[PDB]
Design a protein around this ligand. Structure first.
Ligand SMILES: OC[C@H]1O[C@@](CO)(O[C@H]2O[C@H](CO)[C@@H](O)[C@H](O)[C@H]2O)[C@@H](O)[C@@H]1O
Length: 417
C-alpha cells in the first residue's frame, strides 16, 4: 500500500477572505463604458454558456461559433413597469428576468456580433417554470448536444436535454431538444435542501472529463447540508485570523459550497453525488457557476460571487474567485492568497456578472449596471468586453481587453447528419 491523504473539502476561510483586495489592478476588470452597445431590443441576456466539448474546448460547428444564454423578454409596454409619470422603468423588468428565464442560442462566424437563434426548447418541453444556467456539451460529428441545465420551480434539479445543432451557410438551428432528463437534486446530508433552507442554491452544472483519469464528473453550486442557522463557524472556518478579527458575527448563515458528482458511464446518464470540493461556511453564501481550467497539470477552479453574500465582518467585490490544486480532489489553495481573481472596480461595482474563464484565458461576462452620473445608471442585459487573464502557479494577472461578447473558438467540429 502507498497511503494517500484522504479527500476532504478545502475550506475557504474567513482569514483567506480578509486578504481580499478590492484595489488590486492585477485582479480588477477593466471599466465598462457608459456607451456600451446592446445586442437585442427584444430580449435581455445574462449568463452566457459557449458551446464546448466534454474536455472544455470552446467549439465552433462548421465554422459557426455558438453561445447559449439565459434570456428574458423586454416588456417596455407592460403597465406593471410604467412609473408615476407613465414611463417604462427598465430596472423593474430587468429585476424580474430570473422568474421568466429561458435558454436561447446565438451564432456568429467571427465569435462576436452574435445573431439571435431563439429558444432552444419549444413551448411545453421544459418541465419547470424557469431554465437556469448550465453547459451545452457538443458530443460528436452528428452535432448531438447534451444541454445540462438547472430546471427551477418546483425545486431546483440538475437535468439534461439532448438535441442537435444543424448549420447552413446562412446560420444555425437547434433541433430535437424534446426530452428533459432528471439527473439529481440536493440530498440533505451533503448538500442543503429547500426543506433545510428556502434560499438554498442547487444550480449551474459544469460537466467535464477529468484529463488525468478520463472519468466524467460535474461541478455545481450548492450549500453545505443542514438546517439554515444550524451551521457553526468553528476554528477551521474562521482560519488563521489576526488579533481583533475573532468575531464571526452571524456568518454561520453563509454556507456556500462547490459540489461535485461522478458519472457511472461515458454518456453522462447516471450520476452519483460526492461530498463538496470547496466550502465557504462563515465566508460566502453563493459560490456560483463553478468551472475548471486545466493548465500546467493543475486544476484551476473558478467560482463567481457577490459582495452582498459575504459573511458578517467580511467584504469583497462581485466577480471571479478561484482556487488551484495539483489534484481534482484537492487540496486547493486560494488564487492570489485571497481567492480573488477578477473583481469589479469599486467605482462600477455591478458593471458585470456571471463571468466564465475559458481555457484560452479569455473571460466573458454580461453587463448588469453601469453608472453614468452621481444618481444615474444604465442596465445592460448584453455582453461585456471579454478580458484576457493569465494563470501562473497560484497567481492570476489581468492582461488585455477585447471586444464586447468576444468568444472565439478553440476547436472547430465538422458536423453532418
Ligand atoms: O438567472 C439565474 C442564474 O443566474 C446566476 C448568475 O447570474 O445567479 C443569479 O441568479 C440567482 C437566482 O435569482 C441568484 O440567487 C444569484 O444571486 C444571482 O447571481 C446563476 O448562478 C443562475 O443559474
Amino acid at each position: 500500500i502507498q497511503p494517500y491523504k484522504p479527500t476532504k473539502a478545502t475550506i475557504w476561510s474567513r482569514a483567506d477572505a480578509l486578504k481580499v483586495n478590492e484595489y488590486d489592478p492585477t485582479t480588477t476588470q477593466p471599466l465598462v463604458s457608459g456607451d456600451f452597445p446592446v445586442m437585442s431590443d427584444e430580449v435581455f441576456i445574462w449568463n452566457t454558456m459557449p458551446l464546448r466539448d466534454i474536455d472544455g474546448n470552446i467549439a465552433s460547428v462548421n465554422g459557426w461559433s455558438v453561445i447559449f444564454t439565459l434570456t428574458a423578454d423586454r416588456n417596455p409596454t407592460a403597465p406593471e413597469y410604467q412609473d408615476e409619470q407613465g414611463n417604462y422603468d427598465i430596472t423593474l423588468d430587468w429585476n424580474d428576468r430570473h422568474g421568466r428565464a429561458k435558454m436561447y442560442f446565438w451564432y456568429s462566424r467571427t465569435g462576436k456580433d452574435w445573431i439571435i437563434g431563439g429558444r432552444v426548447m419549444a413551448e411545453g418541453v421544459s418541465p419547470t417554470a424557469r431554465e437556469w444556467a448550465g453547459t451545452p456539451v457538443l458530443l460528436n460529428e452528428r452535432g448531438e448536444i447534451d444541454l445540462y441545465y438547472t430546471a427551477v420551480t418546483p425545486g431546483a434539479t440538475v437535468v439534461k436535454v439532448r438535441g442537435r445543432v444543424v448549420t447552413t451557410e446562412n446560420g444555425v438551428e437547434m433541433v430535437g431538444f424534446k426530452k428533459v432528463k432528471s439527473l439529481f437534486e440536493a440530498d440533505g446530508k451533503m448538500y442543503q435542501t429547500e426543506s433545510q433552507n428556502p434560499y438554498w442554491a442547487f444550480r449551474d452544472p459544469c460537466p467535464f472529463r477529468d484529463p488525468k483519469s478520463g472519468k466524467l464528473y460535474m461541478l455545481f453550486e450548492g450549500n453545505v447540508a443542514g438546517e439554515r442557522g444550524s451551521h457553526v463557524v468553528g476554528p477551521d472556518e474562521l482560519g488563521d485570523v489576526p488579533p481583533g478579527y475573532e468575531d464571526a458575527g452571524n456568518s454561520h448563515f453563509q454556507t456556500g459550497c462547490i459540489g461535485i458528482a461522478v458519472c457511472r458511464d461515458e454518456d453522462g446518464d447516471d450520476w452519483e453525488l460526492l461530498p463538496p470540493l470547496i466550502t465557504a461556511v462563515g465566508v460566502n453564501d453563493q459560490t456560483e457557476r463553478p468551472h475548471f481550467v486545466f493548465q500546467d497539470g493543475k486544476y484551476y477552479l473558478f467560482t463567481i460571487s457577490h459582495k452582498f453574500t459575504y459573511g458578517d465582518g467580511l467584504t469583497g467585490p462581485d466577480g471571479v474567485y478561484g482556487f488551484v490544486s495539483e489534484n481534482l480532489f484537492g487540496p486547493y489553495v486560494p488564487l492570489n492568497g485571497s481567492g480573488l481573481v477578477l473583481g469589479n472596480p469599486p467605482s462600477q461595482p455591478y458593471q458585470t456578472y456571471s463571468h466564465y474563464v475559458m481555457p484560452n484565458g479569455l473571460v466573458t461576462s454580461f453587463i448588469d449596471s453601469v453608472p453614468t452620473g452621481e444618481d444615474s445608471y444604465r442596465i445592460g442585459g448584453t455582453e461585456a468586453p471579454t478580458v484576457l487573464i493569465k494563470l501562473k502557479g497560484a497567481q492570476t494577472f489581468v492582461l488585455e481587453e477585447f471586444d464586447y461578447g468576444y468568444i472565439p473558438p478553440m476547436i472547430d467540429v465538422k458536423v453532418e447528419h
